[PDB]
Design an enzyme around this catalytic site. Structure first.
Site, PDB file in Angstrom:
ATOM      1  N   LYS A  83       0.809  -1.206   0.000  1.00 48.18           N
ATOM      2  CA  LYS A  83       0.000   0.000   0.000  1.00 48.18           C
ATOM      3  C   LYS A  83       0.851   1.268   0.000  1.00 48.18           C
ATOM      4  CE  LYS A  83      -3.678   2.049   2.893  1.00 48.18           C
ATOM      5  NZ  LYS A  83      -3.975   2.341   4.319  1.00 48.18           N
ATOM      6  N   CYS A 130       0.338  -0.010   5.796  1.00 50.34           N
ATOM      7  CA  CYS A 130      -0.119  -1.370   6.053  1.00 50.34           C
ATOM      8  C   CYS A 130       0.863  -2.175   6.902  1.00 50.34           C
ATOM      9  CB  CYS A 130      -0.412  -2.078   4.742  1.00 50.34           C
ATOM     10  SG  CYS A 130      -0.987  -3.772   4.964  1.00 50.34           S
ATOM     11  N   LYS A 141      -6.436   2.485  -8.074  1.00 44.57           N
ATOM     12  CA  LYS A 141      -5.656   1.318  -8.449  1.00 44.57           C
ATOM     13  C   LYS A 141      -5.357   1.304  -9.947  1.00 44.57           C
ATOM     14  CE  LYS A 141      -8.542  -1.298  -6.028  1.00 44.57           C
ATOM     15  NZ  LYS A 141      -8.870  -0.527  -4.801  1.00 44.57           N
ATOM     16  N   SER A 164      -0.220 -12.056   4.293  1.00 42.26           N
ATOM     17  CA  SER A 164       1.123 -11.969   4.853  1.00 42.26           C
ATOM     18  C   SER A 164       1.525 -13.199   5.675  1.00 42.26           C
ATOM     19  CB  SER A 164       1.337 -10.725   5.712  1.00 42.26           C
ATOM     20  OG  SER A 164       0.670 -10.788   6.960  1.00 42.26           O
TER      21      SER A 164
END
Length: 211
Positions: free
Chosen positions: A8, A20, A47, A74
């Site tokens: 991000k 983030c 985006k 993650s």
């Protein structure tokens, strides 16, 4: 192919690293393993085509280990990195994997509490007290003398806690928790953490709409 990670960006600033903590965990992992890689920044409020191609649903972080397969989450990414680039090891022993696991949700709940008798401050304090007791006995990091994967997860979360609670509540992790303070002092001053942490404003600006 290159090792790549999409994370991000700051809102309206596509060339500035955003806030983030899940993205930060991955970046920390890549830095600590001294892997060569390219970080690609994405402003989620606007985006680009190239990003939507890679991650149609607009999730970050997403990771490419060099094989062309983009993967999300993650928790998944950091273990794929561990399996694929085992040295230097960042494995946290499983007995300590859940250390600090309730801190981040407790922080969010207290951050949002507009009721000062609802028990949220004490609940957070009790989780920090538990982490302090752990670190005093088995520290200075979650798994002793060396940084491991669990620290690269929890560290970003504690950084968000520190910056956001001070800004919105004037609340700080109390200094009588001397092992927690040694831990954040050590973790946050690591080269990898200095490099990957968001500017404070970009972190406050992320939580601001959520408070």
């Amino acid at each position: 192919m290159a090792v790549e990670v999409c994370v991000k960006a700051a809102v309206g600033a596509p060339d500035i690293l955003g806030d983030c903590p899940f993205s930060q965990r991955v970046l920390l992992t890549l830095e600590e393993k001294k892997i060569t890689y390219e970080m690609k920044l994405v402003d989620l409020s606007n985006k680009p085509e190239w990003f939507l191609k890679i991650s149609p649903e607009g999730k970050v972080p997403v990771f490419n280990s060099g094989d062309g397969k983009w993967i999300a989450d993650s928790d998944v990414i950091t273990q794929v990195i561990e399996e694929k680039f085992p040295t230097p090891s960042l494995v946290t022993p499983p007995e300590y994997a859940s250390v600090g696991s309730k801190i981040f949700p407790s922080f969010v709940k207290f951050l949002k509490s507009k009721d000062a008798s609802d028990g949220s401050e004490k609940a957070l304090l009790d989780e920090l007290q538990a982490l302090d007791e752990h670190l005093k006995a088995h520290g200075p990091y979650i798994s002793g003398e060396n940084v491991s994967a669990a620290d690269l997860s929890l560290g970003p979360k504690l950084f968000h806690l520190q910056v956001a609670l001070e800004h919105f509540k004037g609340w700080k992790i109390p200094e009588n928790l001397t092992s927690v303070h040694a831990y954040t002092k050590a973790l946050f001053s690591r080269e990898s953490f200095v490099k990957t942490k968001p500017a404070n404003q970009y972190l406050i600006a992320g939580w601001a709409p959520k408070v």
